[PDB]
Amino acid sequence: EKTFEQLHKKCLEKKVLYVDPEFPPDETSLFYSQKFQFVWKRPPEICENPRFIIDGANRTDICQGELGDSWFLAAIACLTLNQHLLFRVIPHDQSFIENYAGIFHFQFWRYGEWVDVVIDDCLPTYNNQLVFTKSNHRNEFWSALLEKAYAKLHGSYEALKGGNTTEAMEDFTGGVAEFFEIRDAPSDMYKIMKKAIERGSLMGCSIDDGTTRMACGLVRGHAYSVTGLDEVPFKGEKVKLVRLRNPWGQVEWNGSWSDRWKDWSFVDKDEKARLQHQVTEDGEFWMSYEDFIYHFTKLEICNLTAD
Ligand SMILES: [Ca+2]
Ligand SMILES: [Ca+2]
Ligand SMILES: [Cl-]
Missing domain, CATH: 3.90.70.10 (Cysteine proteinases)
Structure with a gap:
């Protein structure tokens, strides 16, 4: 299939921002159980100088929003204590200010192997602020994007409501x-x-x-x-x-x-x-x-x- 690299290159050549067909910015990616509220916005629409990682990826960058996914967030925070492991999950070569095409990726351990999860950078907002996990720095977006990628891996943001910390730890470390x-x-x-x-x-x-x-x-x-x-x-x-x-x-x-x-x-x-x-x-x-x-x-x- 198409790799992150392939899709990224394509979008840059066409000077278009990626929109994820499989996990689109709409109600289907938010919930499953019901049909019911949020505007999707890319980080450059949210603030003037968005950054993927500011001052390192660390635990102060993980602040739960309006979604009960502490089980997952506690595990990300743990992972940042181990920087060399963290960089396997979060590829560092990603930026808003160079080769930006509205597409990001993260790596998780799944069927005895690392699998790549690709996302567009549209994120749920209300009054132009993130509603779901954010960093305590208002311009930093890696943790919000990681959450999105993990939501995609489970079919929806709603699917992250409730879980066991040990599931996330295994998905980040093997x-x-x-x-x-x-x-x-x-x-x-x-x-x-x-x-x-x-x-x-x-x-x-x-x-x-x-x-x-x-x-x-x-x-x-x-x-x-x-x-x-x-x-x-x-x-x-x-x-x-x-x-x-x-x-x-x-x-x-x-x-x-x-x-x-x-x-x-x-x-x-x-x-x-x-x-x-x-x-x-x-x-x-x-x-x-x-x-x-x-x-x-x-x-x-x-x-x-x-x-
Ligand atoms: Ca940071
Ligand atoms: Ca304190
Ligand atoms: Cl950046």
Whole structure:
């Protein structure tokens, strides 16, 4: 069939913007169950200087919109902790300012092989803003486009409503997903999680809802990304910590080790820097290992295939 390269070249020669026949910018690509609201617009119509990737592809670029696909977004965020893996999914040679023909592509691991998914860059908007996933930088479009490509792989945006983080992790790595009930967690699980993150394995977690917020700042039935583990010295003892990211890009733990916790004052300025401590409402936060195990019920690890 026609490769991305073939289609891209063709559009450039005809000086036309690609329109995807198989996943067109209309209601069919949005939903399946019902017929029901959004204007489709390409990023150069949304803003004056759109960019595919600004300041690197990282986890601050993944902010959930009006679609319940946290399971997928938590996994993208995890993937950005591992830049060399990330660039297999997101081909870097793509631009709005050079050889632009309104066509992009992404690679996913599917039937024991990398498959290429091609999309046009039309995206759902309302009042000229993205309604679905966006970057916290208003001119950056890779994450919105990746979501679109993944929606195409599943037939519609609506098909991304509900899923398991481990499905996305496998689709991005070709690794093998493993589950832990935190209830049955062994004594050394801090160490297990630490070794996994250092190995570049993707890790997500959630609080089971038997399938809007909690007082402590956590969200039930919601995929979080595990983005770090570390030990800090605090009042003469070493304290084990866990870092998580809510793929909403906001709404955080408000307990100990949270952003605004006063007893951060007792931590040395260099240690703060090593932990990348920042008081910012970005969805990312430290919490104690002890509080983590106490609130979270499910931990999912995707182990990279021993090449
Ligand atoms: Ca970025
Ligand atoms: Ca924060
Ligand atoms: Cl660009």
